[PDB]
């Protein structure tokens, strides 16, 4: 938990590549990797975002690196989307017949196991969940090399969506904003962590 | 790091598993609400009841050293005006009554207007569930740091799993619902190497 960074201490290229790499190598439901990591270093772009990111008033100006994590939309991660076909063939190297079975399974999973086809937002939120795995792993990776981080949800979706859309970063409706993340070196010690009593959040069966 | 099957005769030590569980509990959450519960299911009978409707853990449930159900808080507890939040801010975060009133107002504006979380009970639940996926990742990474393999599991029939957890009393009068499951143990063999999109396809710099 850091809210503010040292604006003059930058995470090295190769430390940041390690953070991004732990994101890329994160697991995802069905191996679909329904994410994109947009690293926003451009000062002016940060300032546009900051106007609608109440939760990053200090983080955006000071962060060494700032990441928008995008999740795939229903357009791309519904069972029968082309993104999934390309993904299974080109990344997972799945034969055509193996991929047909995999897609069938994906279909049954989405429709009847988790009821993801209720709405386009339900599918989006499923893909977004996968991005929170990457988020956690990227923050943990950072911490392991002495790099502080802050997850950021405090933004006005409508504005952020507009800004990213105009910028072309959502790739004709393939993506939407999932969550943001600032990385850098803290300028002060964090609030000491408070957490629920162990017996309130753990039960053994 | 992708394991579908474990050694049923190699158990994670209580101490090693506590390290895993603790990194989960210490995970960050939006607004610090920690909207989760970790149910560790070691009872082989209970595993078998889950297994009947958990297609995605046919081999994991029998063989895992440890099996975890991660629950998320429902609309009942993490809607801005819910009592869970007041108790949480007061008793865990030690917020003065005046500070907590402001925090709740902010939570309300955040949920209604910033992220549109009150579109349905399911959208609000899915927000809390996303917090649980942070913990899930952290638990998996912690495991890997100490040589422990892990498998996340979404491959289950919601309706059946919900019913089973509900009947067992684990959802605490609608306070929780199933978010995601996780198996922990020692692999029976090395996994294939990971395939992933090339870095230039999933990273973009502005």
Residue numbers in the entry:
A (entry chain B): 17 to 221
B (entry chain A): 16 to 221
Q: Could you pull the original sentences from the published paper?
A:
By using a flavin transferase and carving a flavinylation motif in target proteins, we demonstrate that “dissociable” flavoproteins can be turned into covalent flavoproteins. Specifically, four different flavin mononucleotide-containing proteins were engineered to undergo covalent flavinylation: a light-oxygen-voltage domain protein, a mini singlet oxygen generator, a nitroreductase, and an old yellow enzyme-type ene reductase. The crystal structures of the designed covalent flavoproteins confirmed the designed threonyl-phosphate linkage.
We recently discovered a novel BtNR that is capable of reducing a variety of nitro compounds. Inspection of the crystal structure of BtNR revealed three potential sites for flavinylation: three neighboring residues that are positioned close to the FMN phosphate (R15, H16, and A17). The dimeric BtNR-F3 structure was determined to be 2.0 Å. Rms deviation with the structure of BtNR wt is 0.5 Å. The mutated residues from BtNR wt 11AYNFRHA17 to BtNR-F3 11DGLSGAT17 represent the flavin fix site. Intriguingly, for the first 15 residues of both chains, including Asp11, no electron density was observed, and these residues are probably flexible. The FMN phosphate group shifts 1.6 Å toward OG1 of Thr17, to which it is covalently attached. Despite the Cα atom of Thr17 shifting by 2.7 Å compared to that of wt Ala17, the covalent bond is formed. The phosphate group in BtNR wt is stabilized by the side chains of Arg15, Lys209, and Arg211 and the backbone nitrogen of Ala17. In BtNR-F3, besides the covalent linkage to Thr17, the interaction with R211 remains.
